[PDB]
Ligand binder design. Sequence first.
Ligand SMILES: N#Cc1ccc(-c2ccc(OCCC(=O)NO)cc2)cc1
Ligand SMILES: [Ca+2]
Ligand SMILES: [Ca+2]
Ligand SMILES: [Zn+2]
Ligand SMILES: [Zn+2]
Length: 161
Amino acid sequence: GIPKWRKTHLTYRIVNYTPDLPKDAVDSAVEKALKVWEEVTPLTFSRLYEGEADIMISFAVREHGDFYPFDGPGNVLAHAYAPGPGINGDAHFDDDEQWTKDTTGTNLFLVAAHEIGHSLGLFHSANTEALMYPLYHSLTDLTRFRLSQDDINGIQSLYGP
Ligand SMILES: N#Cc1ccc(-c2ccc(OCCC(=O)NO)cc2)cc1
Ligand SMILES: [Ca+2]
Ligand SMILES: [Ca+2]
Ligand SMILES: [Zn+2]
Ligand SMILES: [Zn+2]
């Protein structure tokens, strides 16, 4: 049990969107990913807009010169930060892509959950069922979407024993 600077309560701000799908696809994705860890660990969060919350989810168009420029439908889908004094819980999404919620391309629901897991304080796992797997695993079977002992131990180290 050792979370972000020992803080149990984290705030998140939506500063990203999707040019292809409705706002429910992006806003609810951030919250579902954010609360997917709430449904697994006793973490407390709040969604606001002030200026900059603990976790800042922003969009990144082709002018993405902070790590990698736009690649289009390329494997590079997004990047996030976590153990930092400023970049604490901050991520970016490739706006120039097909963001879907039904694995029809770039599943932002799955990617966001993976990015939120990162920002919360986790890296990459090894199990194929793990939400933090370092390789694209777009599965049409959304009924099998779950957490596994692999990623579980990771989030457990953050907010658990
Ligand atoms: N169940 C399940 C499950 C579902 C999806 C993934 C999945 C998809 C794309 C990814 O792309 C973003 C690149 C990255 O690693 N960023 O930090 C990484 C992970 C894994 C497991
Ligand atoms: Ca891409
Ligand atoms: Ca931040
Ligand atoms: Zn970036
Ligand atoms: Zn990752």
